[PDB]
Symmetry: C3
Subunit: 314 residues, 3 copies
């Protein structure tokens, strides 16, 4: 299968500059060279150039609505184009708002896809529930078909068309949810595994259940959106919103290993890696490294070892 890496150096989805440096950091750490050594064909598309919208005035509380809106429409066009050529897309964030474009362009080709969202946050705040106007916490609000018409039309997002429903998305790692958000997921009935559920069942049971829930009936493509702040701050500290009590390096790799074994991975997002939020040069390498490990794991790398087929090592 072919792989294409698409860099999205965007940070207008939140107040913390530096996230747009994520893609460069992940390459510097050799992400693309390490993927070539797997069983997949890899091509690096490069970084999209995002045009900054002049006089992008705030729409009520939301900030940079036109800049974030345009950025995502441009990304969505690239993802669909590549998805079309029969290739698995790999999106390197900046901030989580880029999830809008990524999933949108993906669904245009595979409208029957399912989303697995690993994050410490649900990011399902609408333009009216948000205490802040940062769009990195509203990504899933622009994608749900059960939320369409539940909030005004934001300047720059007219092109967006709800592509997935509450029943097509499972959350793993939740531990810092806002009131309005916890309301939306209880109301719409979204399947989720917060940290208490992981603690209760174990990572194994969790993955065994998210699959039967999504792939139980039909076998459809999988889009994995991975917010680096889903793992515990001790593992991925260089991020804008770290929260204690997260998934461990081991649990993170287990998820991806199980997702690889399905053979259905079609889309991937490595979001929120902010190289500038490292307290020490090493806290940044730690973050960059585990993110790289999570991507290599998604494409074949196992902890038990790997060896080439038809080669007699003895």
């Amino acid at each position: 299968k072919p792989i294409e890496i698409i860099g999205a150096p965007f940070s207008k989805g939140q107040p913390r500059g530096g996230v747009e440096k994520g893609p460069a950091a992940l390459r510097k750490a050799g992400l693309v060279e390490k993927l070539k050594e797997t069983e997949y064909n890899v091509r690096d598309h490069g970084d999209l150039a995002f045009v900054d919208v002049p006089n992008d005035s705030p729409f009520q509380i939301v900030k940079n609505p036109r800049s974030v809106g345009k950025a995502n429409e441009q990304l969505a066009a690239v993802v669909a184009e590549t998805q079309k050529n029969g290739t698995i897309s790999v999106v390197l964030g900046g901030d989580n708002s880029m999830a809008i474009g990524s999933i949108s362009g993906h669904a245009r080709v595979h409208p029957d896809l399912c989303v697995i969202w690993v994050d410490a946050h649900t990011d399902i705040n609408t333009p009216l529930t948000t205490s802040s106007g940062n769009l990195h916490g509203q990504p899933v609000a622009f994608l749900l078909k059960e939320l369409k018409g539940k909030f005004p039309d934001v300047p720059g997002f007219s092109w967006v068309t709800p592509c997935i429903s509450a029943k097509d998305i499972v959350y793993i790692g939740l531990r810092d949810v806002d009131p309005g958000e916890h309301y939306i997921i209880k109301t719409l009935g979204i399947k989720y595994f917060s940290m208490t559920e992981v603690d209760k069942l174990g990572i194994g049971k969790v993955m065994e259940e998210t699959f039967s829930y999504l792939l139980g009936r039909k076998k459809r493509p999988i889009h994995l959106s991975f917010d680096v702040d889903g793992l515990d701050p001790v593992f991925t500290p260089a991020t804008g919103t770290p929260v204690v009590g997260g998934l461990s390096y081991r649990e993170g790799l287990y998820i991806t290993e199980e997702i690889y074994k399905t053979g259905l991975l079609s889309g991937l997002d490595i979001m929120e890696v902010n190289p500038t939020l490292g307290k020490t040069p090493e806290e940044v390498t730690r973050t960059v490294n585990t993110a790289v490990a999570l991507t290599l794991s998604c494409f074949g790398t196992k902890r038990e070892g790997n060896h080439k087929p038809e080669t007699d090592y003895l």
Copy 2:
């Protein structure tokens, strides 16, 4: 339900001064302001003033028997008074010897209560088994009805009346027990889950079993005595006796989340937080913070999120 915080700035239960600063540290971190934001009514009673007994001579090996004895009789009177007004009591330690008063005053109103003890130690050393004379490691020895008359009468504790039996107390987190103690719990048959049991069954199974064991038949009030050194030193380092291989931040929050879901929480002790034993200013904030989190969790705060009933966030 109403909540009342009672501060017990006492440290005579052991040689390490500084524990009496625990209550002040927990307030400074905003414990009381954060509880008001829950669904409970909160009132801060303040800190009890403990009269130091002059010429409090050692009773054989035990130290400060009259000072610790008086301190606890004074606490027991406050707890019963507040328990009486139909309020859940929240005791902020100093040292673990204050468990005596806390549980005593509690049982006077609810003689049919059960105790869940989270700690790395059993603290069931009697005045004769103790290698040290510190009374913070003898709290549960003054409360058991199966131990009454098994050790002389210590000056200052004549008012104490055994209020619970071996079958009414479950230990979770045990990993540093003395020989004499491990004997007393095997003899009296106390239900316990040491770290090996947690590792074997998982935090979920552990809680599922402590409940059926205690609440299986009758539904009685629950008294949670939480010794901060039950969590691993990496999470709660500012304590007098840290021991590697403890419960994790996640497991700690799971316990309380399950205890909240019962609706039976009637008493609470946050013991052994010693602000002065922090190697760095941050090791102390880490300890204070997780302790605060454990108390908010006990009263409704969930990791999956919380939202106010009857409010339409959409």
Copy 3:
């Protein structure tokens, strides 16, 4: 049962000097004095003196073949001698190459023994698969009967005689395996539990299964070879090849506790503790300490507590 500690201050199995200091560090930390306080009889044999072979030229890629070969033949003679006197042997590494002699001498008395290998590596590289010539990553290649004749005869190992087969060895903790190695274990069908298997089943299930696999039919002696780098670098950092995502202090103590409960422990290796690779004096004490804890756990020490039989502590 009697115990005999044998020190193997050897480091020729790899490029990192300092490992030969392991045995001294573990004694300094009081390993022998703490074992005497258990229910076992302990005798300290001392450290073997290893003669350095002059002009020990490299055999193709392998380094120090004659020095490592001789060292192990000398160790195997001591282990068999002591095993013969009906005593459990305890080998204190240097490097993992000393596993050759240790297991060899052991099997000479108990040819029906089984091996439990706790390590982050399989160390089953043959003289032809190794990317490096270091023999610490080839120990298991000189012991398997299914590999005999699959690689030339290395100078210094003519005395070695394959003593165990693929079906008699279980690996726990794998997470950094070379291609050729992962090939050998898939081909020969070696039973293993890498980190993903531990994550999936839990330490309890893992131990429950390694036992039924090995002791299911016949009850045979157990040889536990423990490579300190099997535990996560946060617990045992002073080692030549640390790898993130390992077993925890708790899991490590659980394994040994279960192994003790079998009553079949006959051999023990505490390998790869390198006192000189500590970044700080404390990273070395942390390593030394957990290793000491693992050995005391192997011989009776439980986390739930221990008390002497026939003594009435009340």
